[PDB]
Amino acid sequence: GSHSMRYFFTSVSRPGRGEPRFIAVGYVDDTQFVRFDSDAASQRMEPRAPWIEQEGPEYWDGETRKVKAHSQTHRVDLGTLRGYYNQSEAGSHTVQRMYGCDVGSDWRFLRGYHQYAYDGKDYIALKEDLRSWTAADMAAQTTKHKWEAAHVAEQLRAYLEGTCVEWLRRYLENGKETLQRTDAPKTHMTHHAVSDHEATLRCWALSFYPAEITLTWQRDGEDQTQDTELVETRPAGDGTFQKWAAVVVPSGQEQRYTCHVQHEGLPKPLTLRW
Amino acid sequence: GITQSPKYLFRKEGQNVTLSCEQNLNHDAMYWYRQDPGQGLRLIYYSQIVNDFQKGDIAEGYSVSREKKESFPLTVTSAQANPTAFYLCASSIRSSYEQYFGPGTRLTVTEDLKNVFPPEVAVFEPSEAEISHTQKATLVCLATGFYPDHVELSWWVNGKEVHSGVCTDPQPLKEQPALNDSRYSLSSRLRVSATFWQNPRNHFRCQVQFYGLSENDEWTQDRAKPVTQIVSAEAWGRA
Amino acid sequence: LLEQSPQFLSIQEGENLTVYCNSSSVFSSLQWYRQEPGEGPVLLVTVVTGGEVKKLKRLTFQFGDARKDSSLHITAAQPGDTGLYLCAGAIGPSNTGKLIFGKGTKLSVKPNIQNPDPAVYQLRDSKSSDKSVCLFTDFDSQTNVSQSKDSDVYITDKCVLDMRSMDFKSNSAVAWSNKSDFACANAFNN
């Protein structure tokens, strides 16, 4: 299938009460493997999947030294952006940063990502060609000109298409026994007595990995969009996922609907009735 | 720009010294290098961002800090075994992009202050044969027996420094090739027209600024304290 | 990895020269510097786009396609173009925040001495009687002065001197010794 490595960084000003909170996490596909928290006592990058513990003490030293540099860089970013928008030293504010790479089935380079947000709105983002920027507003155009003059994108491109992909491959093969494993959803349907006349059919899918899934309802003929709802895929807490889909139906007509579950943990999809 | 003060630094072994590096180019990244004679740069330490720094290829004995964006102080401790070298600071707008260098600082360390000597200076007058054959006159200046090799030679004609017709040795020579902290010499030449040299009211001066001991440095031996000082020799034109 | 080529290159004026900078890896940017010993290196140019060509007066920098190499071309070389030329760069694949530096190519451009007038002169101290030096001057570019074979006698190497009003350049070395029998006539045999 296809795979991604992504890092996420969040910096929050806590004005007067210390200097900003910094939180970093790394994911391979839908499995988190590292974290760094500037508030935690260890002051280290820490493992969060077991297969990353195959990495030696130099991995850890490096990652910790690099993530601390990230930490100060976005601390400085917070002071800078407060200028570019003329804000106040009481206001708490947020810088968000995300980057990483995607690879295809052949495990070769597909796509790369590098983008920022300020207070939850896009600031600047590297375009898919990995050569040009997308600045949301003029303030980011200021960053854009500086990043263009100092040729940020070209060095980014060497990491995203190269180093980033090299790590992902290594991670995928190191943690093969979990990361490359398929978990099929464990399906079951549920019936409720909503306004007497009416019944709710809830189709469940549980303990699957990855989180990607499709849950389609249907009648004797095709899909049933109206009167359906679809939950946000949620985490089980053990690295697997869950998601349900409901419909309201006329009493006595229940057993005529079929849920359809698509996932790569199953050869053929599964169908459910009540 | 990027400043480095001071240009010259002299110390006895064991004495920690901090070199300064300042920049107002609005750069985030700063870098320290050292260079031994006839060799290349060696990265000691660098900082990609304020409040962060990391070891280079030769960090042993050195210490840095980056409390402020503008400054990247380097300390040379007694743990560094061969501290005597040329030290260069550089900055870049972001780390890993084009660096701009400071002017550099020379640090010499000696294991004993009794090796320290100011230059003696002599001006040698143009040859009458040179004047006859070429109608040009070369004065030569000779600065000898100084240690450390921390000098600035310059030429002064009638009270004013000159640069045209001047040539100074790029490197001092060793007077005593065997020992670590040996005395040095340096020659320079000022060439002018015979007519100019043959004016008896023209005054020529070779000047050597020597960087030595401070005025308040402990001097336990009898001869004069080899403090930082200017030593000059002079000649008038002759007709 | 970063190697410069050649280590040394001698060129008499007007000729054209091309020095090189290469890497086993790939550069995300590459810098060329001039550096005078005892001073800070001076930034000539940065190149970033593979295949690109930049000009700075008589200098022309080119960047290889795969950004693994770069070249400096001087068209119509001049004696001021003499010095050490130093290549630096960021290694993309390395994922680091530092530049790498080469050992520098040292270029010597020989001055076109029009009427060489090689002679050795004796100069006497303006203060005392007995002190003197030897001056070898006005020789051409093809002449090198060797170091002293003798530890009794000091000899400087060449310095090119320029009286820029008379549009005139000349070479010279100086020698001296603490013997007084020591003679200028032969001081420069070596």
């Binding site: 890092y7 790394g26 690099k66 540099a69 952006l81 980014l156 | 961002i49 | 994922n95 680091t96």
Partner: peptide
């Protein structure tokens, strides 16, 4: 592994 170089906004 994360980026080894950092750069401000």
């Amino acid at each position: 592994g994360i980026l080894g170089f950092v750069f401000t906004l």
